[PDB]
Structures are given as structure tokens and as C-alpha cells.
Structure 1
Amino acid sequence: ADVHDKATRSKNMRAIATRDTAIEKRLASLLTGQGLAFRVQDASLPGRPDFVVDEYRCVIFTHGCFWHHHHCYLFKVPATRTEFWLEKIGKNVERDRRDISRLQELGWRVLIVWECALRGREKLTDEALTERLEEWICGEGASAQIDTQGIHLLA
């Protein structure tokens, strides 16, 4: 049951950007503070990486917990048009996996930064984020993800 009326829910949905979202803005700011001259929204790479760091041959995705189905407190299965959302979100999850595989096949190290780690009552501190980012980017560690519990290598 939606907390908005049709018109309002439509307005809310129309306001959602496809780049330069809240989580992308905070990550950009963190990377800029670190002195990294990164690129963004690379339509030439699989999944159009949110961020690209050529200098360390790595890319970074900022995942919205709803859109990418993170199994965290931010995600709830829609109670309206459930079938539609389950298929759409399910397809997003499958595409996310494929994108990561392709990038790796191209020689790119991938880092996933979940939204809950960037905003919300469980978000990591600026210091904690900056440290984990700098260590992962500048290091040679394989693909990983950052959630509220810190950083972890991808399966």
C-alpha cells in the first residue's frame, strides 16, 4: 500500500536521476578529497561504471539498495505491482553480475559501494570510507564491496 497517491508517486519516481544521485555525489566528493582525477558515467564499458579510475585500472559502482536489491534494512519488496518489481529488480541483479564479469574480463578491478554505507542511520564515517577507498583503489586487491559492515572481497 503506497503512502503516496498516483500523481505523487509519479512525481517521486520522475525525480529519480540516472546519474549524479545522492550516493554518487557523496562518493564523488570523497574521491575528490582524496585527490583522484576520476572519470564518470563511462558508456564505453559494461554497466556504464559510475566512476572510473584509469590510473589504478579500477571502476566503482554506487548501488542503490532498492534498485540493486541489497539484502539490507533499506530493501523491501514492493506491495504494489509485486510481480513487475520482482522481475525488474531480479533482472537488475542478474545484469549487475554480468557487468562485473565483463569488466573483469577486460582487466578492470571492480568496487561496489552500497547505498546504506553512504547514507542512512548505518552510513560509514567520512574517515572510514576514505580509508577503505584509498586502500582498495591504491592496492592490488581483487574486486570487493563496501557495506555497513566495511569492505569485503566479492565471492
Structure 2
Amino acid sequence: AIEKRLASLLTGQGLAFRVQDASLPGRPDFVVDEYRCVIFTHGCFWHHHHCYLFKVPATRTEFWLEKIGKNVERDRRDISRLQELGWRVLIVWECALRGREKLTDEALTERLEEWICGEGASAQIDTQGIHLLA
């Protein structure tokens, strides 16, 4: 589900990028060839984030937890394969992009500028800032 916010923010920074790229593991939402980095915009429910957007469904609970667990394992392998290929990976969680605690365009823009152009190690952005992936 292509993120409007991010396409316009990346465009404003002067960067060229590909979107929803099926040629790379995980089909990353945005790919910036010039800086060897890819960006995923993950939903907090489907990818099992630890924030307030994560809610356990009251119906077929076990089924849902098993399914979302499998999504997480698949995400870990896609991220490892990308890194083995030489890509840096950023995950921007949904809680940073939409809803009550979302970042301002200014805060979000500054974190993107430093991470892309400063060649930061793989990381993830949430409502509390930027964190390494490992």
C-alpha cells in the first residue's frame, strides 16, 4: 500500500527511487539505487510491532498469532538476504507514519536525510526515534 508521505518526502530530497520492487527479496516499498538502500513501510499489526497499534484479535486468536509469527520469520529472512547482497535496510513502522503518535514531516525528513545520505547501518524508525536492527 504505497506511502504517499514517503514518495513526496524522498522526491523533495532530490532522490531517484524505484517503488514496490519485485526484483529484490521482500519486494521493498522504496529502493534508492544511488545509496544502496531499501525502505519497507510495515503495518504494525501484520508485522508484529510492539506498540499500541498491535492488538490481538478476540476471535480465532491462536490462528492469528501463528500467522503473524510466520510473517515475522519471513521478514527476517528477506532482511538477511538483502544485507548479504549489500543493501542497507530501513523499516519505517506504521506508528511513525500515521495515527496519534506519528512523526512530523520535519522529524521524519531529518531522520531520512541522515540515514540515507550519511550511510547509516540498517535500522528502524518508530515513535521513539531510530534504532539499529542489530
TM category, shorter: over 0.9
Q: What is the distance in 2 between the residues matched to 1:135 and 1:119?
A: 21
Residues 2 and 29 in structure 2, CA contact (< 8 A), matched pair in contact too: no
Structure with higher Rg: it is 1
How many percent of aligned residue pairs carry the same amino acid?
A: 100
Residues 42 and 52 in structure 1, CA contact (< 8 A), matched pair in contact too: yes
How far 1:119 moved relative to its partner? 0.6
Runs of 4+ in 1 over 2 A off after TM superposition: none
* CA deviation profile, 1:47-77 (whole Å, cap 9, x unmatched): 0111000000000000110111100000011
Residues 23 and 115 in structure 1, CA contact (< 8 A), matched pair in contact too: no
How far 1:34 moved relative to its partner? 1.6
* CA deviation profile, 1:103-155 (whole Å, cap 9, x unmatched): 00000000000000001111011000001001100112110000000111112
Secondary structure of the 1:87 match is helix
Q: 1:92 to 1:69 in 2, by over 3 A?
A: same
Residues 23 and 118 in structure 1, CA contact (< 8 A), matched pair in contact too: no
Secondary structure of the 1:26 match is helix
How far 1:23 moved relative to its partner? 6.6
Moved more, 129-138 or 29-38: 29-38
Q: What is the distance in 2 between the residues matched to 1:73 and 1:129?
A: 19
Partner of 1:97: 76
The alignment status of 1:108 with 2:87, answered yes or no, reads yes
Gaps of 5+ in 1: 1-21
Q: 1:77 to 1:23 in 2, by over 3 A?
A: farther
Gaps of 5+ in 2: none
The alignment's TM-score, normalised by the length of structure 1, stands at 0.83
Secondary structure of the 2:24 match is coil
Moved more, 78-87 or 62-71: 78-87
The alignment's TM-score, normalised by the length of structure 2, stands at 0.96
- The CA RMSD over aligned residues, in Å, is 1.1
Residues 91 and 125 in structure 2, CA contact (< 8 A), matched pair in contact too: yes
Q: What is the distance in 2 between the residues matched to 1:45 and 1:23?
A: 17
Q: What is the distance in 1 between the residues matched to 2:46 and 2:7?
A: 20
